[PDB]
Amino acid sequence: SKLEAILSQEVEAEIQALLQEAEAKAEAVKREAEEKAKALLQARERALEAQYRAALRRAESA
C-alpha cells in the first residue's frame, strides 16, 4: 500500500546509507593494508639492492 511504500522506501534508504558506510569502512581497511604491502615490497627491494652492491664490492676486492 501507500504507507507500505513510505515505510519501506524511507528506512530502506536508511539501510542503504548504512551499507554505504560499511563499504567505506571496508575500503578504509583495504587502503592501509595495500600501503603496508607496497612499503614492505619497496623495503625488500632496497635491502636486495644494497646486498648486490656489497656482493659487487666483494667481487672487486677478490
Partner: protein
C-alpha cells in the same frame, strides 16, 4: 512555562499508549462525530496524508 511543561508531560505520557515494532506504529482512538472535519483537516497535514 508551566503550561508548556504540562503540555509536554501530557504528550509524552500519552505517547506510550501506542503500538509499534521497527518500521511503523499504529494507534486507536475515539472521536465524536461532530469533530470529524477538524481531525480530518488536522491529519491532512502529514506526510502523504497517512
Amino acid at each position: 512555562l508551566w503550561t508548556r511543561a504540562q503540555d509536554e508531560v501530557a504528550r509524552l505520557k500519552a505517547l506510550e499508549e501506542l503500538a509499534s515494532g521497527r518500521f511503523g506504529f499504529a494507534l486507536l482512538g475515539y472521536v465524536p462525530v461532530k469533530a470529524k472535519p477538524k481531525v480530518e483537516e488536522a491529519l491532512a497535514r502529514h506526510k502523504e496524508s497517512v
